[PDB]
Amino acid sequence: QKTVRWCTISNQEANKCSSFRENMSKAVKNGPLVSCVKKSSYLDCIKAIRDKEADAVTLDAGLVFEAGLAPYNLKPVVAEFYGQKDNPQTHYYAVAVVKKGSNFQWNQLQGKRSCHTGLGRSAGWIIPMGLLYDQLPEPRKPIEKAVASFFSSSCVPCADPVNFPKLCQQCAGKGAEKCACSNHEPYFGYAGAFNCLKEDAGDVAFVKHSTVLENLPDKADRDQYELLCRDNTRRPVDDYENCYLAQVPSHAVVARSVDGQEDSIWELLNQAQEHFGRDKSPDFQLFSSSHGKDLLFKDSANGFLKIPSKMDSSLYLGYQYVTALRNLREEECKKVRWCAIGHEETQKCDAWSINSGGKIECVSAENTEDCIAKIVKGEADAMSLDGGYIYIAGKCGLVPVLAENYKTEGENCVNTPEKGYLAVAVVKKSSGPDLNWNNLKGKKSCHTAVDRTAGWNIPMGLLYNKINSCKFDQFFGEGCAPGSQRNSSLCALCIGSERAPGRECLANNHERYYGYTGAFRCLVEKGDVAFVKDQVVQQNTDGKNKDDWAKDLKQMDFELLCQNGAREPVDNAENCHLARAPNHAVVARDDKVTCVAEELLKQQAQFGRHVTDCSSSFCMFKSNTKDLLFRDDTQCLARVGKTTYESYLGADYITAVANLRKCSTSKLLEACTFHSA
Ligand SMILES: *[C@@H]1O[C@H](CO)[C@@H](O)[C@H](O)[C@H]1NC(C)=O
Numbered sequence: 001q002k003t004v005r006w007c008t009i010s011n012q013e014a015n016k017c018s019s020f021r022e023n024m025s026k027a028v029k030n031g032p033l034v035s036c037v038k039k040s041s042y043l044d045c046i047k048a049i050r051d052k053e054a055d056a057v058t059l060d061a062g063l064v065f066e067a068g069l070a071p072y073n074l075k076p077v078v079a080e081f082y083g084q085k086d087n088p089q090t091h092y093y094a095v096a097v098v099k100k101g102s103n104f105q106w107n108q109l110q111g112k113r114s115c116h117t118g119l120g121r122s123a124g125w126i127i128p129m130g131l132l133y134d135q136l137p138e139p140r141k142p143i144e145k146a147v148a149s150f151f152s153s154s155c156v157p158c159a160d161p162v163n164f165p166k167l168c169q170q171c172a173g174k175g176a177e178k179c180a181c182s183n184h185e186p187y188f189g190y191a192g193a194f195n196c197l198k199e200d201a202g203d204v205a206f207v208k209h210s211t212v213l214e215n216l217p218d219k220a221d222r223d224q225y226e227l228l229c230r231d232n233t234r235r236p237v238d239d240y241e242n243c244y245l246a247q248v249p250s251h252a253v254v255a256r257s258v259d260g261q262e263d264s265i266w267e268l269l270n271q272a273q274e275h276f277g278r279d280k281s282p283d284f285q286l287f288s289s290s291h292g293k294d295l296l297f298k299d300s301a302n303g304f305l306k307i308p309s310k311m312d313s314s315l316y317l318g319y320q321y322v323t324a325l326r327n328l329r330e331e332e333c334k335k336v337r338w339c340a341i342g343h344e345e346t347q348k349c350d351a352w353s354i355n356s357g358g359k360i361e362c363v364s365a366e367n368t369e370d371c372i373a374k375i376v377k378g379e380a381d382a383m384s385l386d387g388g389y390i391y392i393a394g395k396c397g398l399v400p401v402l403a404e405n406y407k408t409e410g411e412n413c414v415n416t417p418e419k420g421y422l423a424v425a426v427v428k429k430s431s432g433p434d435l436n437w438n439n440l441k442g443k444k445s446c447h448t449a450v451d452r453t454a455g456w457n458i459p460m461g462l463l464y465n466k467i468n469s470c471k472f473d474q475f476f477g478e479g480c481a482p483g484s485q486r487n488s489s490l491c492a493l494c495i496g497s498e499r500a501p502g503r504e505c506l507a508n509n510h511e512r513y514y515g516y517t518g519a520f521r522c523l524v525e526k527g528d529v530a531f532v533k534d535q536v537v538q539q540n541t542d543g544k545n546k547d548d549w550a551k552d553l554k555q556m557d558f559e560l561l562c563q564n565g566a567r568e569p570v571d572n573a574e575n576c577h578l579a580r581a582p583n584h585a586v587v588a589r590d591d592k593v594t595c596v597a598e599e600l601l602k603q604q605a606q607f608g609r610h611v612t613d614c615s616s617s618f619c620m621f622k623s624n625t626k627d628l629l630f631r632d633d634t635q636c637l638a639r640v641g642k643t644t645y646e647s648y649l650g651a652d653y654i655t656a657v658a659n660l661r662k663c664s665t666s667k668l669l670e671a672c673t674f675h676s677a
């Protein structure tokens with residue numbers, strides 16, 4: 001019924017696509033149909049997809065980046081994987097292949113002849129040229145001109161043969177097909193570049209790690225070839241793991257960002273790998289063809305993986321690679337951009353910005369995950385996170401910069417490491433003794449949010465060990481666990497916002513039961529147990545909180561549930577808690593750690609706890625509502641040195657969280673753990 005229109009770039013690809021079509025028709029009765037649209041290069045395909053004349057094409061990651069730019073706006077939806085299906089690799093190695101006895105090293109490439117897969121491609125172009133950049137003769141813009149003056153001549157398929165003739169000089173295509181961006185140029189692609197070297201049109205080929213073994217005959221003339229290593233030595237072709245230029249992400253199928261039919265694309269490809277995958281059929285091979293190498297998909301792929309929905313091109317490629325790509329394409333610690341979540345945090349941020357004289361700038365997002373993603377992508381620089389989210393951010397590659405401290409007051413606060421706060425379970429003293437730790441089934445729970453330390457990871461981790469199931473919403477009766485599935489019973493007690501409707505169960509300040517205070521309010525108004533930090537009761541009772549719901553509460557009206565079944569007063573969490581919680585911390589990308597840390601230590605020297613008059617001046621650690629930007633009981637931000645999320649959080653906490661990985665519903669976590677190695 002549904003049709004996926006695949007874009008081909010050559011007569012050879014068109015031949016394979018016709019057989020893909022015919023074979024899928026026969027093998028799959030109801031699965032999407034395939035039809036083929038024949039263009040003459042990947043760039044014509046990207047445009048055909050944008051204009052809705054086609055739906056899909058497979059691209060080297062370097063070109064995924066170009067497809068993801070305006071005005072094309074395509075996104076990667078399915079990735080090739082290499083290697084064994086039980087340990088799929090979503091990267092491959094770029095290498096430089098030379099013939100034995102040619103006697104030159106990496107540092108002597110000047111004046112040689114080069115064979116490239118194609119302009120703008122990972123192994124063929126982006127990686128080798130990024131490495132050689134500093135040796136190219138200036139001016140290096142555009143890069144083509146500099147490359148044409150560095151190598152004596154080359155074959156770079158897809159280069160403009162009119163403006164850069166030397167880049168197309170060693171290519172082998174006839175007439176108008178010379179230097180073509182397709183299999184009509186014999187030296188196009190991995191196979192082509194290798195043939196370029198083989199036939200002595202070039203002295204070096206920039207290809208991938210499987211290229212030589214894939215393209216050499218029945219037996220091994222393989223001893224005739226070697227690899228150029230970056231330490232200026234040469235190694236055998238099967239020793240690429242010790243002689244590669246870089247590791248690069250998989251070729252991926254791309255599609256329209258809006259109305260891209262990706263559902264259809266995955267359904268097609270998934271069924272196709274089942275019937276016509278590696279060694280699956282004599283009638284048709286997805287990853288092979290008698291008409292050529294790497295047609296439609298690479299011959300070294302062994303299947304497909306669906307790309308998570310939150311992985312856009314930036315996330316798929318990774319920030320380092322996007323920066324190298326950006327570097328070759330366009331031809332400081334002045335400020336810290338904070339990521340604020342929602343309106344109240346944005347207003348506190350704005351105030352900070354003004355008071356700081358612009359050293360702090362403010363970027364907004366509607367939830368924690370969107371903030372973390374902005375930081376990873378370079379749209380923001382820092383925010384403070386609960387341990388549960390540090391874990392997620394750490395998987396996405398962010399690093400802890402400074403810790404919030406809660407126990408140490410005064411001048412030594414910044415230099416004192418704290419062990420952590422405590423995750424506890426708080427109940428009303430008035431609840432009968434049947435309410436205890438071993439009898440929570442069917443009870444009404446209040447949680448700070450899904451994926452936070454005290455609110456979720458610690459308690460739900462403990463419970464998972466008992467019930468051996470991720471269906472928490474079938475264990476508890478009804479609760480408020482912000483961030484849960486909207487029609488779950490774990491959203492049923494949530495009350496959203498007083499001003500705007502439809503905000504129930506959101507994991508942000510629109511939800512009145514969100515956060516430490518929030519969950520304590522949930523306990524007071526509706527729940528039986530709150531999963532929260534120690535001290536939340538003391539901080540919101542006996543008059544410290546003046547809001548209607550809290551003004552008459554007393555500390556003595558609450559108790560803690562201990563794991564042995566007993567109950568203790570709230571002043572005794574040290575002997576009645578669920579586990580230690582790592583202190584919340586400011587995270588940043590590895591390139592900004594120093595900058596973020598140094599400026600914040602200066603911010604707090606001006607705006608920290610010692611400010612006796614908050615109003616005339618700004619107070620970083622006090623908040624109009626609750627835990628705006630930092631926890632309200634934060635005494636200072638403290639140095640953590642050079643550490644990683646794993647050592648910051650501790651093996652005990654890492655163990656607990658990883659224990660729950662099967663139950664995770666975080667879309668960010670799913671995107672940040674997609675890639676191998
Ligand atoms: C609840 O919502 C989801 C969509 O987000 C839907 O898939 C599910 O089947 C709905 N019904 C149930 C079983 O609660």
Ligand SMILES: [Fe+3]
Pocket residue numbers: 060061121122123251
């Ligand atoms: Fe590639």
Ligand SMILES: [Fe+3]
Pocket residue numbers: 386387452453454533581584
């Ligand atoms: Fe916390």
